[PDB]
Ligand binder design. Structure first.
Ligand code: 30I
Length: 245
């Protein structure tokens, strides 16, 4: 996350942390995710396509830190990895950039909800918030685009939604953005998502309850003028989600 503020998992308990085994014992961070249901985490597809085998992957919950074991956390293996059949990578864009992970532990159980671990609700269909709505992104992504490293502590920030009409501008993303994608940004372009945040949530409060409006997907440089963050428009993928569960 570019700018923003640090946080713990108690502020964003649905947040999930996805790591991949090696290939010689090493365990590196891959992407974020959101627990939508006890056995189901949702992520982005582009996160896994290079190494799309579930046995490679580990998923932790109730984890506020990157390489340090947070108290109250739970570790999970991927029982099933479900990438979106119609996915495609444009040079910049990622189409249908949405993934489902079925989680289970070594004891073969899903999550137990705790103070540090809780599900996020999904929108009602096609029911997105008004543009300019302040909305919340979370992840262990780069603090600045020049950084090699990801931050050790979890971060979150605020971004305001942008109408499609607006994001369609050639000045912005031109053609690249579709209506299954959302844009968001800080009016100053001061804070943003970045690499490593991908798969992580975009949670707007809608109808007096918090709601998973988007999944961090792509962007040209973290936090640059006239280049918002682009997120998978979750309201648009509800049947796919529903079915694949
Ligand atoms: C040159 O610097 C630079 N570094 C990283 C990225 C990048 N950004 C995002 C991202 O979420 N961006 C955003 N919300 N603005 C994102 N989700 N993924 C990113 N990448 C991940 C590595 C694979 C190649 C694409 C870049 C772009 N530019």
């Amino acid at each position: 996350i570019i700018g923003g503020e640090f946080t713990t998992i108690e502020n964003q308990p649905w947040f999930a942390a996805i790591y991949r085994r090696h290939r010689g014992g090493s365990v590196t961070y891959v992407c974020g995710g959101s627990l939508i249901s006890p056995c189901w985490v949702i992520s982005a597809t582009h996160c896994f396509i290079d190494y799309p085998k579930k046995e490679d992957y580990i998923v932790y919950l109730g984890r506020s830190r990157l390489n340090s074991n947070t108290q109250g956390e739970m570790k999970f293996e991927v029982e099933n990895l479900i990438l979106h059949k119609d996915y495609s990578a444009d040079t910049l864009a990622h189409h249908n950039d949405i993934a489902l992970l079925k989680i289970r532990s070594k004891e073969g159980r899903c999550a137990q909800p705790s103070r540090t671990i809780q599900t996020i609700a999904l929108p009602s269909m096609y029911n997105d918030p008004q543009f300019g709505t302040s909305c919340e992104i979370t992840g262990f992504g780069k603090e600045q685009s020049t950084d090699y490293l990801y931050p050790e502590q979890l971060k979150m920030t605020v971004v305001k939604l942008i109408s499609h009409r607006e994001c369609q501008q050639p000045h912005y993303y031109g053609s690249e953005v579709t209506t299954k994608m959302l844009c968001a940004a800080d009016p100053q372009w001061k804070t943003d998502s970045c690499q490593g945040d991908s798969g992580g949530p975009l949670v707007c409060s809608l109808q007096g309850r918090m709601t998973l409006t988007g999944i961090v997907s792509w962007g040209r440089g973290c936090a640059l003028k006239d280049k918002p963050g682009v997120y998978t428009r979750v309201s648009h993928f509800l049947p796919w989600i529903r079915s694949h569960t």
